């Protein structure tokens, strides 16, 4: 009936899209030199690690999205406050 | 307030215009096809 199919209906592909968008959220369009830059890899590393914590702590698909959605908004606010000076 | 940070936060989401917008819209089509 229901044993441990939780992670069976969730694919790596689905998550891959989530991580990619997670990066996009912070850096929408990096230039060719930025993409091959260490800072970008570190940025992806953040997305990769955060992806790990989410999957481990989520326990549920709804929570999986919920955790990320709140997390993205938190960054978004931080970026916006930062932009206030850097006009 | 810092103790019940999670609870207090949870309440705000319930009245977060952009959060609700992005929450509904984005989850409306989670990409995923091999």
């Amino acid at each position: 009936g229901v044993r441990k199919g939780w992670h069976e209906h969730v694919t790596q592909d689905l998550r891959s899209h989530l991580v990619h968008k997670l990066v996009q959220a912070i850096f929408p369009t990096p230039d060719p030199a930025a993409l091959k830059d260490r800072r970008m890899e570190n940025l992806v590393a953040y997305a990769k690690k955060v992806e790990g914590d989410m999957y481990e702590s989520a326990n549920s698909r709804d929570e999986y999205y919920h955790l990320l959605a709140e997390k993205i908004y938190k960054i978004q606010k931080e970026l916006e406050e930062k932009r206030r000076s850097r006009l | 307030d810092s103790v019940t940070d999670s609870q207090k936060r949870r309440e705000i989401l319930s009245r977060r215009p952009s959060y609700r917008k992005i929450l509904n819209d984005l989850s409306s089509d989670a990409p995923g096809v091999p």
């Binding site: 912070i26 930025a34 938190k74 931080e78 850097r86 | -």
Partner: peptide
Amino acid sequence: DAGNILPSDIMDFVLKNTP
């Protein structure tokens, strides 16, 4: 909450970029 905010350095660079 498991740290939903980034360290300053990550934010510092991204803001320094503006397409």
